[PDB]
Structure 1
């Protein structure tokens, strides 16, 4: 029995969020929460919220027990980019890209 949680159109870069995602793969949920509580990065907050939502779904829609859950999968993908303009010297112009990501977490008893 597996349960899913997603965060779509999140304001960050996949490269930056994968660093935090790599810390908590294959671990128990309580230990994962403890690890995430003491990481001094901005992506820790987002990943933590997604994990908490997944646990709540697991125990409300599927009748699960917290003490037997495990982070079975986690991944980050790219989203659409916003395009902006930045002036430079001597009348030149430049393009600015603002990147976005999708975050997915899967928890299971097995």
Structure 2
């Protein structure tokens, strides 16, 4: 029971998500919710909603058992960059790459 749960088109740079994501890899789901609550990033509340959804998908679809559950694999990838025009001085134009992210959390007991 792998029960992969992901999010697509998240509003983040993708680098700042890895600072949160690398700490939670290997830890328990009970401890993981406690870390993300008091750790302060905008991506922390985003990954919390994906992590709680990942546990919720294991409860309803699969046979649940949230008392003992670890996170085996976790990773984030770069998304479709929204392109805009930022006004810079002396008639120069900056491309201003607004990046998006693909948060993915594979949570499983085995």
TM norm structure 2: 0.94
- The superposition leaves residues 53-87 of structure 1 with CA deviations (integer Å, 9 ceiling, x where unpaired) of 01111011011200121111110001111111122
Q: Which residue of structure 1 aligns with residue 36 of structure 2?
A: 36
Distance 1:60 1:89 in 2: 55
Structure 1 segments of 4+ aligned residues over 4 angstroms from their partners: none
Aligned to 1:83: 83
Structure having the higher strand fraction is 1
The CA distance in 2 between the partners of 1:2 and 1:105, in whole Å, is 10
For these two proteins, the number of residue pairs brought into alignment is 110
Could you tell me the TM-score, scaled by structure 1's length? 0.94
Measure, in 1, the Cα distance between the counterparts of 2:50 and 2:93. Answer: 39
Q: Secondary structure at the match of 1:40?
A: coil
| Structure 1: gaps spanning 5 or more residues | none
Task: Provide the secondary structure at the position in 2 that maps to 1:51.
Answer: helix
Shift of 1:89: 2.1
